[model samples]
Target: GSSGSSGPPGPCLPPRLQGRPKAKEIQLRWGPPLVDGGSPISCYSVEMSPIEKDEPREVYQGSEVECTVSSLLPGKTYSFRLRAANKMGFGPFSEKCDITTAPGSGPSSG
Candidate 1:
């Protein structure tokens, strides 16, 4: 490999969101950007939006590749997206992924 002048990296690839549906939480996982931008990854930004919501909410933003989103309403559906960033700047966001939470537990019958 030659130590030539490698141009700045481009936008990172989108991550994949995986988790158990009908639950109170979900997990997000992703890999490094397809282009390194000639530097190491600085952090990642994650966002979420409800099926009927008007805006997307920021869930997490850090260096970790995986994150768990909790405190979600039961029996509701949500959409998620994420992107990678480096010293240069942030990349494009991933496609929206949907997840539905399970029904909440009702009062226990004694």
Candidate 2:
């Protein structure tokens, strides 16, 4: 095999948003990567915002693939990319899931 030496895991499979209809919250579920680049992983990182790829910030880090966020805004869409990390280093990144805070909750507002 002409592969490179040991290194950080590759990017995760892709992410998905499992959400409640019109709820001001989200559940992020990510798919696992095909390989670990022989460098296994321990944790996954998540960052959420509105289309600002450069302003990446961490909001959560956990072992499970699923993460949650609450009380965002009414129908305001947000996206987050999931990435995995190992002792060597963090993987590139996975797909960004978009969950629109649908218009439902009210303070007498939409």
Candidate 3:
């Protein structure tokens, strides 16, 4: 058994936008937080809002520093936020990011 240890880390730095623009997907990249609450980061949660009236939903969750969000609609605007979690709890969510889908990502899906 361990004796002295820090705590779960603070919320990681706000996720950054990366990955070349694709038809129906977006990628996220982030670095470790400034404070680690003694425990190592367990998982990550990425949320997305279509810029519509509806609230955001979970698109990805894991230890990886990057997540690819797909199945999005073209010509639509969206926002995203992410937070890191550990055994104790999670850090504050990162800043929200806004992005727009290409007007014609593909042959009209309609």
Candidate 4:
């Protein structure tokens, strides 16, 4: 390797959402961006929308890396994406994710 011979960093890996139970609300987990010191990440913008629709509706936005989406319709298919923002501006949008909100509550004792 030589000095000043390296290229810019590659695209950051998008955080994956997990631990979401079959319910009306979904929980998303996202780690920090790949690059640590490029720019201070202000927050992550979470967006979702019906699968049938082309445009995504902004579901939630926060300063923290993790977030929870609420008020989702049960049994409906939705897509999600996370975008990073900093003092300069917003970075590239993450890959699209598709998930269906669980219909009704899970098995419960009467």
Candidate 5:
């Protein structure tokens, strides 16, 4: 008889940010974890924090590799981080990525 045990998968690789900053939104993109924790990736967790306030918040958590965060104040700077999860558990978060939202546009004349 023999017994073998390996720990859960390693932390996910760092993710990269994508898309141009809008007046009130920013799109994020990333790939699957390098190691799948003996199973397929179940979902990813995205976190956002205002540079000034430094209060991090969970914006999204799902299987999708892409997501858009809205309702941000225009012209404000924000930082983001992400990580992947499997049936085993969640992995470490990626390096922080900072971005600034575009300036808000004036109201239409109508």
Candidate 6:
């Protein structure tokens, strides 16, 4: 007899910083939280916001694990969170992290 189909897959693995402090843009990476589940992870949702008082805001979303957030306001502190999803729905968000954008330099006149 069939063991009965399992429910949809769970959330994705907690996101981790790949290459930080190396460049202005930060690279975020993540993986499947569980293997051999009911379904496969469709994609991921990336969110960021000022590390101040405001809540986090969605910055990017795609299938890849890494994304480059350009034209960032230099010298500003920012927090980031990631979430995974399958056909069922999105899972819980990952822990947020703080990062300060590189200090911006005035445009060179020369």
TM-score of each: 0.72, 0.76, 0.75, 0.73, 0.79, 0.69
| Descending-TM-score candidate ranking | 5, 2, 3, 4, 1, 6
lDDT comparison, 3 vs 6, better candidate: 3
Clash totals, every prediction? 2, 1, 7, 0, 0, 1
Q: Model 1 over residues 14-84: C-alpha lDDT tens digits?
A: 55655554357767677777776677778888888887784687789988888888878888888877777
| Candidate 6 deviant stretches above 4 angstroms | 1-14, 18-25, 35-37, 105-110
User: How do all the candidates rank in terms of lDDT, highest first?
Assistant: 5, 3, 1, 2, 4, 6
- Candidate 4, lDDT over the whole model: 0.68
lDDT of 3 by residue, 1-110 (tens): 78786555665566777855455777778766667577778888888887774588888888887877899877777888878888888777777777776675456556
Off by over 4 Å in 1: 1-15, 19-22, 105-110
Model 6 lDDT tens row, 1-110:
75776444454454566666322465666665664246677877878767887767777888887776654566777787777777776767666777776665545578
lDDT of 2: 0.71
Weakest 10 consecutive residues, lDDT, candidate 6?
A: 6-15
Which candidate number has the best TM-score? 5
What is the Å distance of residue 60 in model 2 from its true position? 1.4
Candidate number with the higher TM-score (2 or 5):
5
Best-matching candidate per lDDT? 5
Error of 6 at 59 (Å): 1.0
Q: How far is candidate 3 from the true structure (C-alpha RMSD, Å)?
A: 4.1
Give all candidate RMSDs, comma-separated.
4.2, 4.0, 4.1, 4.5, 3.4, 4.0
User: What is residue 71's positional error in candidate 2, in angstroms?
Assistant: 4.5
Better of 1 and 3 by lDDT: 3
Say which prediction, candidate 3 or candidate 6, comes out ahead on TM-score.
3
Clashing pairs in 2: 75-101
